[PDB]
């Protein structure tokens, strides 16, 4: 089997991406945010508190007939920027553009942070990390991609996130029409429970390649590039009037600049990440500081090669019996 979902920016910026999914019996779509760093499906629901609700879509459990309440199970998780949500575990079923998954775990929010309540163009998650990363008590749940696995044509899925403009999350194949030139396959440690890899280095603009060993994790859910003190330092020593902000909390730059663009390594092959794509608009309305794209990663304790990076290639997120990560110009 495979599935195939079209992949949305929820706004001007590409903060985030949204993918229909369908749940329960009659289908209720919900639009989630796939992220491949965390393992939780969460949607927000008939349970969540009323004053925590603007504008998302709710799943409501009692209307669907395959909907099972998962005696005693709960769930509870923290993001990387302060967010949270929690709630109780139905078992639904779950389809992603064709590909359907039946008893899988489906966490229903009876709690949100303010950056989830105040964010209406996302209904939930769906986490497309390894599951070892799962929340649910006493007995922690599957991801839809773990729960698919064994029935796809091949064990894999695919990232082709859009640059202001409309993508693909695949399930069970590679579309060889989607980039060009080839896939080039590197190591994944699932260690930390995230698609784990080590980059070979990077290039700024039209400068020479800096072969370094690169350590981050291939996250779909992460809007921006983290990469370490030194290379963001290389990256925005390029830009006139770039600076490091406190009050920001980043690198500013002047929203009449033109950036240079940034290459990562795969192996021995390259990914270009244009300009245009490193630019998040005004700190602020009406602001001529903008924000960058390319941040430290120094308080994170972790590299993130986030949307900024991932939307410049063609991803393959190999499930494998030893995981491996795919990389192609596009
Ligand atoms: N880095 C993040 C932050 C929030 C979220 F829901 C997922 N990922």
């Given at each position: 089997s495979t599935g195939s979902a079209t992949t949305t920016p929820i706004d001007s910026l590409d903060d985030a991406?949204?993918?229909?999914?369908?749940?329960?019996?009659?289908?209720?779509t919900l639009n989630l945010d796939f992220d491949t760093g965390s393992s939780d499906l969460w949607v927000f629901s008939s349970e969540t508190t009323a004053s925590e609700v603007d504008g998302q879509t709710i799943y409501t459990p009692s209307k669907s007939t395959t909907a099972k309440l998962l005696s005693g199970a709960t769930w509870s998780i923290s993001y990387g920027d302060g967010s949270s949500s929690s709630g109780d575990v139905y078992t639904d079923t779950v389809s992603v553009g064709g590909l359907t998954v039946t008893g899988?775990?489906?966490?229903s929010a009876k709690k949100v942070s303010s950056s989830?309540?105040?964010?209406?163009?996302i209904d939930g998650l769906l986490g497309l990390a390894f599951s070892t990363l799962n929340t649910v008590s006493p007995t922690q749940q599957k991801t839809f991609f773990d729960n698919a696995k064994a029935s796809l044509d091949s064990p894999?899925?695919?990232?082709?996130?859009?640059?202001?403009?409309?993508?693909?999350?695949?399930?069970?194949?590679?579309?060889?029409?989607?980039?060009?030139?080839?896939?080039?396959?590197?190591?994944?440690?699932?260690?930390?429970?995230?698609?784990?890899?080590?980059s070979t280095g990077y290039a700024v603009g039209s400068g020479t390649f800096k072969s370094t060993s690169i350590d981050g994790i291939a996250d779909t859910g992460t809007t921006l590039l983290y990469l370490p003190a030194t290379v963001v330092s290389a990256?925005?020593?390029?830009?006139?009037?770039?600076?490091?902000?406190?009050?920001?909390?980043?690198?500013?730059?002047?929203?009449?600049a033109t950036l240079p663009s940034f290459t990562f390594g795969?192996?021995?092959?390259?990914?270009?990440?244009?300009?245009?794509?490193?630019?998040?608009?005004?700190?602020?309305?009406?602001?001529?500081?903008?924000?960058?794209?390319?941040?430290?990663?120094?308080?994170?304790?972790?590299?993130?090669?986030?949307?900024?990076?991932?939307k410049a290639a063609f991803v393959v997120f190999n499930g494998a019996t030893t995981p491996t990560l795919g990389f192609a110009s596009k």
């Open positions: 991406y949204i993918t229909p999914v369908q749940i329960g019996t009659p289908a209720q899988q775990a489906v966490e989830f309540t105040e964010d209406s163009t894999v899925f695919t990232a082709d996130l859009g640059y202001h403009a409309p993508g693909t999350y695949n399930f069970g194949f590679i579309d060889t029409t989607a980039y060009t030139g080839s896939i080039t396959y590197t190591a994944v440690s699932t260690k930390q429970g995230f698609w784990e890899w080590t990256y925005w020593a390029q830009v006139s009037g770039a600076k490091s902000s406190s009050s920001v909390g980043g690198y500013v730059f002047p929203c009449s795969v192996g021995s092959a390259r990914i270009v990440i244009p300009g245009d794509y490193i630019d998040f608009g005004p700190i602020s309305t009406g602001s001529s500081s903008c924000f960058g794209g390319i941040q430290s990663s120094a308080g994170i304790g972790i590299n993130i090669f986030g949307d900024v990076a991932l």
